[PDB]
Amino acid sequence: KVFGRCELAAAMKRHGLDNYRGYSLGNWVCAAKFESNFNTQATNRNTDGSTDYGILQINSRWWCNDGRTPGSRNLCNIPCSALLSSDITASVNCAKKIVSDGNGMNAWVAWRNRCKGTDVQAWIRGCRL
Ligand SMILES: [Cl-]
Ligand SMILES: [Cl-]
Ligand SMILES: [Cl-]
Ligand SMILES: [Cl-]
Ligand SMILES: [Cl-]
Ligand SMILES: [Cl-]
Ligand SMILES: [Cl-]
Ligand SMILES: [Cl-]
Ligand code: NA
Ligand code: NA
Ligand code: NA
Known part of the structure; x- marks a missing residue:
């Protein structure tokens, strides 16, 4: 789904x-904008052979299991495929664990490079929330 x-x-x-x-x-x-362009099905292979999955490009080295990432962990206890769902629950639950990891939203390099310090309030401007 493209939100x-x-x-x-x-x-x-x-x-x-x-x-x-x-x-x-x-x-x-x-973060979601620059990671996935709001597309839950986004996937991107990393140079180290891990893969990033979903609206928040959660990586298979630490966070989810994809069955093809050597020496990796599955700290969110989920198949990486669950992160491609039109229902964002798995991605949100796993992003909560990531942002609690110690480096806050710096875990998302696109966030650090494109969002951090900017007028992020613009992203929710005019939304009925
Ligand atoms: Cl937009
Ligand atoms: Cl493969
Ligand atoms: Cl694996
Ligand atoms: Cl693990
Ligand atoms: Cl799995
Ligand atoms: Cl949802
Ligand atoms: Cl923080
Ligand atoms: Cl805001
Ligand atoms: Na994996
Ligand atoms: Na993994
Ligand atoms: Na493996």
Whole structure:
């Protein structure tokens, strides 16, 4: 599923992501924009042979199991395929564990490079939330 901007903002809010670990909803929307362009089915192979999955490009080295990532962990206890769902629950639950990991939203390099310090509130501008 390809979400609308306000549509994804609303689902992220519904799933308790607004201000989770102190990150406003605009941050999460901005990250999703640059990670996946709001597309739940997004996948991207990394140079190290791991893969990133879903609206938040969660990586198979640490977080989910895809069956093809040597020496990896599955810290969210989920097949990476669950992260491609039109229902965002698995992605939100796993992103909560990632952002609690110690480096906050810096875990998402696109967030650090494209969202961090910006006017992220623009991402939820005009949304009925
Ligand atoms: Cl947009
Ligand atoms: Cl915001
Ligand atoms: Cl393969
Ligand atoms: Cl694996
Ligand atoms: Cl594990
Ligand atoms: Cl699995
Ligand atoms: Cl959803
Ligand atoms: Cl933080
Ligand atoms: Na894996
Ligand atoms: Na893994
Ligand atoms: Na393997």
